[PDB]
Design a protein around this ligand. Sequence first.
Ligand SMILES: COC1=C(OC)C(=O)C(C/C=C(/C)CC/C=C(/C)CC/C=C(\C)CC/C=C(\C)CC/C=C(/C)CC/C=C(\C)CC/C=C(/C)CC/C=C(\C)CC/C=C(\C)CCC=C(C)C)=C(C)C1=O
Ligand code: SF4
Ligand code: SF4
Ligand code: SF4
Lengths: 188, 318, 155, 45, 176, 115
Amino acid sequence: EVRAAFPEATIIKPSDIFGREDRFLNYFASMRWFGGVPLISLGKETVKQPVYIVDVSKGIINAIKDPDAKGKTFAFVGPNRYLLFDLVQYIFAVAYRPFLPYPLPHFAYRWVGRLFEVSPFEPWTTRDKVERVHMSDMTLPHLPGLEDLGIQATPLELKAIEVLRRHRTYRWLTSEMEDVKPAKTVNI
Amino acid sequence: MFMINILSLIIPILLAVAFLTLVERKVLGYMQLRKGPNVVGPYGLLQPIADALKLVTKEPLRPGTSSISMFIIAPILGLSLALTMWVPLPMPYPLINMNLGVLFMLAMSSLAVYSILWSGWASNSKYALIGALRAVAQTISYEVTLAIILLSVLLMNGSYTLSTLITTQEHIWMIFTSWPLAMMWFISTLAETNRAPFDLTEGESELVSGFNVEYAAGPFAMFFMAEYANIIMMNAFTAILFLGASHDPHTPELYTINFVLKTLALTITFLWIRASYPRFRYDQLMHLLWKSFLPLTLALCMWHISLPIMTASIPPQS
Amino acid sequence: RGEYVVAKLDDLVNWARRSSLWPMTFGLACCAVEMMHMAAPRYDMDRFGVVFRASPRQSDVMIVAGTLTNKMAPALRKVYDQMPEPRYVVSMGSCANGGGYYHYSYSVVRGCDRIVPVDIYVPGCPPTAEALLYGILQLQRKIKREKRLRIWYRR
Amino acid sequence: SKVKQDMPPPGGYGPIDYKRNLPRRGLSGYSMFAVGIGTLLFGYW
Amino acid sequence: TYKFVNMREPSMDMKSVTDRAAQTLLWTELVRGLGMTLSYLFREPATINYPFEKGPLSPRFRGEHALRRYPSGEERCIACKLCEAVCPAQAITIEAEPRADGSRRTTRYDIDMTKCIYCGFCQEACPVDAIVEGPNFEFSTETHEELLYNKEKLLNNGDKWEAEIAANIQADYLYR
Amino acid sequence: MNIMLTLLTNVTLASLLVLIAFWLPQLNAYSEKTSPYECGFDPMGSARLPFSMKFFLVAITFLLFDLEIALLLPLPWASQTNNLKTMLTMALFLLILLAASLAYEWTQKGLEWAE
Ligand SMILES: COC1=C(OC)C(=O)C(C/C=C(/C)CC/C=C(/C)CC/C=C(\C)CC/C=C(\C)CC/C=C(/C)CC/C=C(\C)CC/C=C(/C)CC/C=C(\C)CC/C=C(\C)CCC=C(C)C)=C(C)C1=O
Ligand code: SF4
Ligand code: SF4
Ligand code: SF4
């Protein structure tokens, strides 16, 4: 609809965005409260390609300055794609909290999402949110990405402690980046 | 209806703890050429409620380096003891009449320090550990005489029951017979509650806030009641201990009015002392008590055991 | 209507905050000494509900009063970050309102706002102990006029 | 006309106290102990 | 000359020793303090309630600036830049221009109330009593931009507090 | 019956107070807010390193002092005996010994702070 009303409207298509107040890394980090970490089919069939917040922020700024952003539709995506189970493995390793995955059928998770929607305040997990975690980032190589603008993507491995240092207990609070190895990346 | 009695001994105290804060602000202010809170409602009578809602709706800060389980037990332990240590007090007729009332008085009074102890440790900071350990140092000097003064004064009462205190004080005040002990008890009760000259554990000018530095909102609000409910209760303890009023067997109104007035007069003096003197040093505090107080306790306790036998004035046990 | 009960709970919450806000013990320079005169018996800040509590963990409004310099700017923002929510920062005096007399020097940040989200600006060099006495009360009106739950019930 | 400033009145000014005027009050030290013992004796009796 | 302050050796007579012993044993100077505060409790508080009653000032008080104008209505400022040349904080920024009537007024008179320190030199500077701080110590704003005054705000302050500035200057124009 | 009912009621009321305190106020945590307080600047980093306090000697003596305050507590019931001659002698022994233990504790430095 916006493209129809405003033909020369640059449309930015970010993937999952991670950062300090992202509700994506914090989502899995906060999952520790409710027992273990529930992933449907262990989350082994869902590949995600997150992108750091600042790069997309610089992407918008560069798009404004760029005289060629008129009409184009950019897809802002990160450098590497990670299977969701390995991504959660990376998150809980960086937070050093114990990982307790367990399978959960799709219909029952949808029921769980319904229960959490009841809260009249900021919901923690909706049925819609459960679906998003399952939605693997569709690859759109024809769509002009991020490097054409000029911004080089920052791998999530570098700037991951920013989000998750807070979630660490006092025990592993001063632990650095190199303590936890980079997670395996299913690449294109 | 015993449950109705329990709330009738908790909620009326809680409002009494609340209004002590407003009274202290005004008493301190009027002893300062100031006026004190007088805009929140009439005469500032709405001020405690204004602070009441703010704190419980204040952001309750969780420090990351803090140990969470011990973080929350301390405010619970502080308040729980404060209320439950009101229950043996013989307000006309004590709610919980026990043959060992004062021993139970000391037990939870000694249990109270673990609030400032665990909270000081759990806060995980320099000022947290400084306040908690000086809280040990302040309270370590403190129980040794607190028991002795309690023992010496009560030795001519007859037993450890708090109800019989009134019968002993039926004719004259206890302070007439043990005023050297009463001054020394009063300083310690001023001291057990970490108040006025002995407030090293808090130490605003020297420890910012001491143990309370990393305690906000309700967890702070809870710490304030434990401190202030102990103020009223300890003064009430002193009022019965030394200034036991007359008790008509048929009208408990008479004792209740007199007893409450004595507690109010004593609690004002706590604010009176708090305004006037400067603050000690925790080394001098310990040196003041174990070098000057404690030697006097032993001889005074020596006097108060020899006196009943020499005068054939031992008190009845039953 | 739910709007009525929300507004009634709205008025209850803020009235608690505006009548019990505690200015921190945060003084810097010449602008701080006369602020003591506000706390002095002449004006008696405490009568209006405030208490001068230290320990930013237990304070609401931050009285940035004095010249804000380079060497301390990290200390202030660490202090401001430690203050719980809600928190307000009243930039007090011309030094903290843009640099004051030393606006053009080399080790002063020109304005307290460049480090902190600065609330109502009270000017003066120094502002009279009464001049920001209104500054504190004028903030109490700002606390009065907030919506919070009104937005939440309409979010 | 006449030069008028804030000059002090012709009689200068009243004498201003500056020396310490800390009053001394209270019973004699012997009396304080005497009355203190007196209450003790009455209390014992 | 000089006066020794504290070396007063106490006497060792039995009366003096018992007095000190009574003082240490039966705390007296502590009670002297308590009696002092209690006496200072029943006084009259020095507080004044806010805006309903306000503190006392003097006619030469320094506060919010204002740009007055002649009895005819013409503005006093002939843009001599003296106030800018004496401004210790360099808050004054003015540019002049030959006005349509031919008179010599200023196009811009931005006073940055966040820089100047209320020295009052500006009121001493202009020989036409153009700029002068008003008695209004109260102009606190919620945003930083509001404090940055321009010529228009200065004239508005001149038109608002003109009754005070005429009276206050009338009182103190002889002392200076 | 009554005593644990009183005990249970008090811990319950406290639990609710902290519960509404810790849940209601619409939290917002951003890491540096949870950072330790160090008087405006960063902590040097410790607070669990061994805080060597200097009143160690006076610390243990307090334990020994309390052990004998329990001994001299039964005096109110001890005075109601048929042998006050023996009871008075043994009672005064404890206070004499307690003073004696303190006197040695005092004279041989002891009570003094460690610097
Ligand atoms: C460096 O710079 C500085 C400044 O400037 C920048 C300054 O200006 C000043 C000058 C200002 C001054 C005020 C001078 C003193 C200030 C200092 C910092 C000096 C050091 C201070 C001290 C040594 C003394 C500190 C004393 C204090 C803090 C006073 C404490 C006691 C009080 C009575 C006041 C506080 C009272 C409070 C908070 C109100 C009560 C508390 C509550 C929680 C409210 C009640 C709550 C409830 C009842 C709970 C809810 C329950 C309910 C309603 C019951 C019903 C419901 C149920 C469910 C049961 C200084 C010194 C300075 O150095
Ligand atoms: S604004 Fe003026 S009074 Fe305040 S600190 Fe700066 S120079 Fe001093
Ligand atoms: S009052 Fe002084 S510092 Fe302020 S603008 Fe005028 S001359 Fe400059
Ligand atoms: S305000 Fe005064 S000093 Fe400034 S330009 Fe006008 S006349 Fe000159």
